[PDB]
């Protein structure tokens, strides 16, 4: 009926890791190629995603146990889950009133039409926006938001992983913390854990659709030349 | 004592090719990652160089005979000479009064200190600035400026070329046009042709030094990740 010391330490280390890799000022966005409103938003959104990938890597390096994995498993987990963590962490800037991501200014307010001008279609953007709204309606505590990103990253059912038992044990330990936190600290969160696990399933569907549309984008050199080396490396099909 | 029709057609096609790939407004520069004044200028200057490489490719495709070469020779010539043509074409924005490149605004005014903040040292920048000033003092006609870029690009003594005789014949035809133009149309240009050929030798020295410093830049992933895919492909060591 209460969390242990080792479990609250996991929560503390995860919250601090998120505060160190997510800047609420969005002042770094001025360093991206500016937004233009064919595929006029691709340069800006490619820099946005690339920048966010660096943050997800920094967040991952501070998750307990992730750094003790082999370098190959760390890469396999990051490559398969990078786009999902980005969709997850972007809920912090998503607004139900605007149905868009607001990052401090009209130039950094991204709507559905802005992502279509980056080579993507509604068959990805409709479920994406439909994913952000119900995740926003869940009204997760920050402790639950960061736990869900950690659980998503430490998923064993991802291509390329070798130590299935070591990573599953990590993910199980994070799930028990999340269940216990919601039980003790979140009133009325009786149905919340199931709803959070369902969002992981939605992320797999969003991940599959993004990879399909990214492949078509990356097969045209006039578009793939607008991407960044980190985006090409992380979303690329190279296997270790 | 006068140029033929076939030679003035070469001049016309070269001048038009330069007017189609060099915009004097520099309005596209706002789309680069903004300049910051470690290696704070690398993102902006990498976008500047990458953008300029696309222009040099467009210029090359309109040189008479270049497009009839095999795709491999075109790539070999572009990869070895890209940085030289960029140094050549940048004289148009270089100013003796400022000893810098002015591209319409203080944010797009690049001095020697700005390039040091992109990973380069004075052993490249001192000869580079010493190359721009004497090239500016030559006071080339636009017909001579574009002929020199064409001659530089169609050099046979470059790694990877296979059809040595076909490209040398092209370069020889361009040199006869340049000699004849200076003879007939440039008063007092009696010593100019030799001075222009000497600048080609200086470009080889500037090219060697840039490749050395680029290699050190590209071997550190934290810096090579700030480059563009086109820069990595053109300056890369891949051989066809």
């Amino acid at each position: 009926h209460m969390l242990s010391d080792e479990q609250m330490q996991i929560i503390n280390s995860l919250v601090e890791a998120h505060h160190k890799t997510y800047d609420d000022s969005y002042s770094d966005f001025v360093r991206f190629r500016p937004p233009v409103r064919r595929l006029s938003m691709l340069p800006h959104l490619a820099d946005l995603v690339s920048y966010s990938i660096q943050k997800v890597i920094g967040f991952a390096k501070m998750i307990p146990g992730f750094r003790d994995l082999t370098a190959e498993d760390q890469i396999a987990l990051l490559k398969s889950s990078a786009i999902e963590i980005i969709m997850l962490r972007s809920n912090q800037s998503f607004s139900l009133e605007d149905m868009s991501w607001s990052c401090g200014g009209p130039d950094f307010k991204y709507c559905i039409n802005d992502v279509t001008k980056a080579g993507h279609t509604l068959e990805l953007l409709e479920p994406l926006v439909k994913f952000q709204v119900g995740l926003k309606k869940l009204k997760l505590h920050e402790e639950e938001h960061v736990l869900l990103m950690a659980i998503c990253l430490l998923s064993p059912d991802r291509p390329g992983v070798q130590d299935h038992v070591r990573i599953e044990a990590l993910q199980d330990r994070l799930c028990d913390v999340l269940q216990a936190y919601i039980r003790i600290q979140h009133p009325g969160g009786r149905l919340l854990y199931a709803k959070m696990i369902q969002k992981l399933a939605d992320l797999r569907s969003l991940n599959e659709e993004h990879s399909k549309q990214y492949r078509s984008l990356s097969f045209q050199p006039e578009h793939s030349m607008q991407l960044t080396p980190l985006v090409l490396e992380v979303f690329g099909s190279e296997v270790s | 004592h006068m140029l033929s029709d076939e030679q003035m057609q070469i001049i016309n096609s070269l001048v038009e090719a330069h007017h189609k790939t060099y915009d004097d407004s520099y309005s596209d520069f706002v789309r680069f990652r903004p300049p910051v004044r470690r290696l704070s200028m690398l993102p902006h200057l990498a976008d500047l160089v990458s953008y300029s490489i696309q222009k040099v490719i467009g210029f090359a495709k309109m040189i008479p005979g270049f497009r009839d070469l095999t795709a491999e020779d075109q790539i070999a010539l572009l990869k070895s000479s890209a940085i030289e043509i960029i140094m050549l074409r940048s004289n148009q924005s270089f100013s003796l009064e400022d000893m810098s490149w002015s591209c319409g605004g203080p944010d797009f005014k690049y001095c020697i200190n700005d390039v040091t903040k992109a990973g380069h040292t004075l052993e490249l920048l001192e000869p580079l600035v010493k190359f721009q000033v004497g090239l500016k003092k030559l006071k080339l006609h636009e017909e001579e400026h574009v002929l020199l870029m064409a001659i530089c690009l169609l050099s046979p003594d470059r790694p990877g070329v296979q059809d040595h005789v076909r490209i040398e014949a092209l370069q020889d035809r361009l040199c006869d046009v340049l000699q004849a133009y200076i003879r007939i149309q440039h008063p007092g240009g009696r010593l100019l042709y030799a001075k222009m050929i000497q600048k080609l030798a200086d470009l080889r020295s500037l090219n060697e030094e840039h490749s050395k410093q680029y290699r050190s830049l590209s071997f550190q992933p934290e810096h090579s990740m700030q480059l563009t895919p086109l820069v990595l492909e053109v300056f890369g060591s891949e051989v066809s």
Binding site: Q54, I57, K61, A71, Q74, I75, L78, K79, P229, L230, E233, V234, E238, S240 | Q220, P221, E222, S224, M225
Partner: peptide
């Protein structure tokens, strides 16, 4: 081969 990832993943 995962050059940028390896660098970013180390200290």
């Amino acid at each position: 081969r995962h050059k940028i990832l390896h660098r970013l993943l180390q200290e």
